[PDB]
Amino acid sequence: RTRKVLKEVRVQDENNVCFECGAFNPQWVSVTYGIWICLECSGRHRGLGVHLSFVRSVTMDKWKDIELEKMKAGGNAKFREFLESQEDYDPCWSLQEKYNSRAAALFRDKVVALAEGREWSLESWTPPQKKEMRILMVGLDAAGKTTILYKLKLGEIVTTIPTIGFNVETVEYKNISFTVWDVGRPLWRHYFQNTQGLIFVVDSNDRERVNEAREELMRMLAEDELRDAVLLVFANKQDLPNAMNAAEITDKLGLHSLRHRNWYIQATCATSGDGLYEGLDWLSNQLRN
Amino acid sequence: RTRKVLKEVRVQDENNVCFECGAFNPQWVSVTYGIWICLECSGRHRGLGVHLSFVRSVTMDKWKDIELEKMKAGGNAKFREFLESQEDYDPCWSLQEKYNSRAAALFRDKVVALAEGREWSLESWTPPQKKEMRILMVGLDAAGKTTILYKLKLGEIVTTIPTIGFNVETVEYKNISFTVWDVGRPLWRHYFQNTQGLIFVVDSNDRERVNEAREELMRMLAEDELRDAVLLVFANKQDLPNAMNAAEITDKLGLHSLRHRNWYIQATCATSGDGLYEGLDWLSNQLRN
C-alpha cells in the first residue's frame, strides 16, 4: 500500500524537489504538511519537534494509512501556495520561525482535517519566541563569502532565488541566521529587519574595485533598518602577495570617519580560515551586548 | 576564555578528527564526553537526547566554565581508550546503543566528576532497548554496494577499519543498521549477532567471478549466527548489455537448492536505482514478521 501511494504522490505538485533547498529527488518527508525534503533538511526538520514536524523515510519506515492520507492532503506546491496566501507570511523566515508561524499551524490543521475526510474552514495560535536574528554577509562578487560561509561549518548552505538576479545563500543554527548575497534592491529590506550584524567582505587584492566596495558599504550603512547593526569587515585574501594590508583597506573604505557604529576590521584568509574565527568572536561578543 | 581554551584542547588527544567518522577538523563537540565531532555527526548526536549528548558549536555558541572544564576532562582518545577497557564494550555498536551503554554512563559521570575537580571512583545503570538490528550488505568488490548504500539516502556513510584489510561502510536510521564490506574473517562474527537480513550483491555482468560469489554466499549461509537471516540477492548491473538475467543468476548461485530460508532475487540497476526500493520493500516486509 505505502510504496504505490508514495510513488503516486511524488509525481504530483513540486514533490520531486526538496521543499526547503530544492535538492532533486527527496527520499524523506514531513507527514505534518505532506512535504518532501532531502536527507540534510530532514535532519534540520527533526530538530523542530515531533509536534511541529513528523519526519519519515520514503526508503524504509513504519507507515500508517492516516500518514499516507496526510501525504495526499498535503503537498510541496500546496504548502508553498498556502503560505504565500497568508498575512503573517515572511519569505525571509528562518526554518524555526517558518514552522512556529500561524500560517504553518493552519496548514497543519488543514492537512489533519482533509486526511480525516473532513471539510476544512479557513475561518475556524500564539507563535513562540536574544530573539530570532540575522547576520548579513555581503560584499562584491568573488570577495570569498561562499568560502567564509562554508568554513563556518555551522550547517547546510541553502541557495534561494526570491527574485530574478537575486541569489541568496543562507545558513542557520538555533536563532542565528547567516545570509549571503553579492552587491555592486527592494527585497533586501526584508532581510534587514532582523539584521543585528553586517559582515562586509572585501577582496584585499582587488585594487581596481576597492572604491566600488566602499560605495556599496556606504550605500548599506545609509540604510535605516541597518542603523544599529554592528559592522565586521573581513579584509580577505591577505595570503595573496600584492594584497593591501588591513590599515590600507581601513583607509580606502573610510572606516575611521564612521561614528555611532561598532566596527572592526579583520585581516583574513578564507581558504585557510586564518582570522575567520577571531573576527567572528568579536562580532559574537558585540552581539552578546 | 572559551576560544583560547578550545584551541588548546583540540591540539590534545585525537581531537583534530571526528570521534565517530574520522572526518578532519571537527567544528562541533559533545560536551558530555569532551569529544569532537563533524557537523554531520553532530546532527546524529543531537538526536540522541540532551541527557545522553549535549552538542555545542566550536564556531559560535553559549559557553559556560563548567562546559569548558568538561571538554578538558573528556577527550577523543580518552573516551575511546575508556570504552575499550570495558566489559560491556562492543566495537560493532550502533551510535544509539554506544550511547545507551553502561560504559557511556560511566564516562559521562567521570567527565562530570573531574570537571567539578572531584576524585573519581570506577567502583562507584540499566540501558534502554523490533530491537536493535543489522542488515548485512556483502558481495565481491565492484558489485555496486557503495552505490546501493548511497542510493538508499538513509543517512551518513561511515567508513571504519576495525582491523587491517577489513573496510566497513555503515549507515544508521533509528534501530536499523546497514553494514557493508567486500568478501572473496573472525571480526565478521561480531556483526552477525544482530543480523536479521543479509543482502548479497552480485555483478550480473561479471561471468568470470559468478562462481566465486556463489562460494562466498554459501560460506555466509553456512554461518551459525546467520541461520535465521532473511536473504535478499541483488542481481545488479542489469542495465549492461551482456549481463546475465535474474533466472540465470538464480541458477549459477544455486538459490533453488536452499531450504529453511526466505530468499528473494531482485534484478536491479544501482546507478539508476531501478529495483532497489522493490527489493528493499520485500526485505522490510519479511523483517516485519
Ligand SMILES: Nc1nc2c(ncn2[C@@H]2O[C@H](COP(=O)(O)OP(=O)(O)O)[C@@H](O)[C@H]2O)c(=O)[nH]1
Ligand atoms: N587566495 C585566496 N583565495 C580566496 C580566498 N577566499 C576566497 N578565495 C577564492 O576567491 C574566489 C571567490 O570565492 P567565493 O567564496 O565563491 O566568493 P563569493 O562570490 O564572495 O562568494 C574563489 O576562487 C575562492 O576560492 C582567500 O582568502 N584567499
Ligand SMILES: Nc1nc2c(ncn2[C@@H]2O[C@H](COP(=O)(O)OP(=O)(O)O)[C@@H](O)[C@H]2O)c(=O)[nH]1
Ligand atoms: N552499469 C552499472 N554500473 C554500476 C552499477 N552499480 C555500480 N556500478 C559501478 O560499479 C562500480 C562499483 O560500484 P561500487 O558501489 O563502488 O561497488 P562496491 O566495491 O561493491 O562498493 C562503480 O564504477 C559503479 O558506479 C549498476 O547498477 N550498473
Ligand SMILES: [Zn+2]
Ligand atoms: Zn533539502
Ligand SMILES: [Zn+2]
Ligand atoms: Zn563525523
